[PDB]
Amino acid sequence: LGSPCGGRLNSKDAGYITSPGYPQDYPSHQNCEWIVYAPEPNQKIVLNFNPHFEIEKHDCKYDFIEIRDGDSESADLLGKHCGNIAPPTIISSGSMLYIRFTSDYARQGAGFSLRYEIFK
């Protein structure tokens, strides 16, 4: 239970996933991993980001959030977002969603926040 950020979350109760310290500036050298899953295999997950969204942009090479369609990091990529504009609504294809936030050494911003729930 040492991990500063991340974890497996059960989506039957809607919750939130945020960069460490949001809305304040996230730390440097971060490497958070989330897995949110639906209780039963038929359901799917839908994410909605908050409009306040500040991640260092450099073609998303340094600070970024990435979303993929499954448990592993090798699942099909749904998006890798940085910059000023929050990403649109994401809807899982299966019943598992992989989320990861990465921070480098230099400059930080407010970060991201999203809310996960079961679709419909």
Add this chain to the structure above:
Amino acid sequence: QHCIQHNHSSITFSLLTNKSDLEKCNFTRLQAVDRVIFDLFREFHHRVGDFPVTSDLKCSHNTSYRVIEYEVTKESLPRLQEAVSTLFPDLHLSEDRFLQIQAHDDKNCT
């Protein structure tokens, strides 16, 4: 055109349109390799004040091609324009461009 003159060397400020291939500034590296561009940079940057994290700021880390480059965005523009205005009165930036600071070792401001 918009430039400052020193001793057989000049620092020109220019507005460019195409995205450069430069990488993020590494200030510790940029300090060690060429301190002239770095102290110039920090004189300029303090006038700039708050520069948005979500606007790129890239560096050459080269002595033959010494360039610091800001990205002029919706948010970048006001602070960058207020700063450049202090030095040059004929430089008015605009969105979706890049303001680039190049150092020339022997060409002068003419």
